Amino acid sequence: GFKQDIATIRGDLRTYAQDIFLAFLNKYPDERRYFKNYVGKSDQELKSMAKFGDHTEKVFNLMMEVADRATDCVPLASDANTLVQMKQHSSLTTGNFEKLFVALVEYMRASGQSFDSQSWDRFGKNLVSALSSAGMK
């Protein structure tokens, strides 16, 4: 289930993080406008950029912590507040997060691993609801 999925991702985090983030960017190419220097590059080009791996790993490090601190796929209010208040997230709306979790869930469903994709969908929705409660537009 969900808790074991956290351990699974953590066991091979950089690989999962890059693959999920690439799934997100490829499904939603216009989301690249939030990032510098990602446009005009193939998956393999991005994976060789030193910033790409390091930053995607940091995102998913924190995403896994938020998932881990959750109860029944409900994140902590303080974790949601952190995500809203981060300067790097100042221009974002909940829709950006919805798209990320659509891509993540689709990746899990298409994978050869036994992810509890429904729980990740629930977590994504609960996170969006928490982001809204915390004041994200």
Nearer to a copy of itself among residue 26 and residue 48 (C-beta): 26
48 part of the interface to a copy of itself, by CB under 8 A: no
**18 contact choice in ligand HEM, a copy of itself, ligand Oc1ccc(I)cc1, none (CB below 5 to 8 Å, kind-dependent):** none
39 part of the interface to a copy of itself, by CB under 8 A: yes
- The one among 4, 78, 88, 113 contacting ligand HEM by CB under 6 A: 88
Secondary-structure percent of the chain, ordered helix, strand, coil, rounded to 5: 75, 0, 25
58 part of the interface to ligand HEM, by CB under 6 A: yes
In whole angstroms, the minimum distance from the beta carbon of 26 to ligand HEM comes to 13
In whole angstroms, the minimum distance from the beta carbon of 114 to ligand HEM comes to 17
Q: Which residues are 71's β-sheet partners?
A: 74
92 part of the interface to a copy of itself, by CB under 8 A: no
How far is residue 66's CA from residue 29's CA, in Å, rounded to a whole number?
Answer: 26
Residue 107 assigned ligand-binding role: no
How far is residue 137's CA from residue 134's CA, in Å, rounded to a whole number?
Answer: 9
Q: Given the rule CB under 6 A, which residues bind ligand Oc1ccc(I)cc1?
A: 21, 55-56, 59, 100
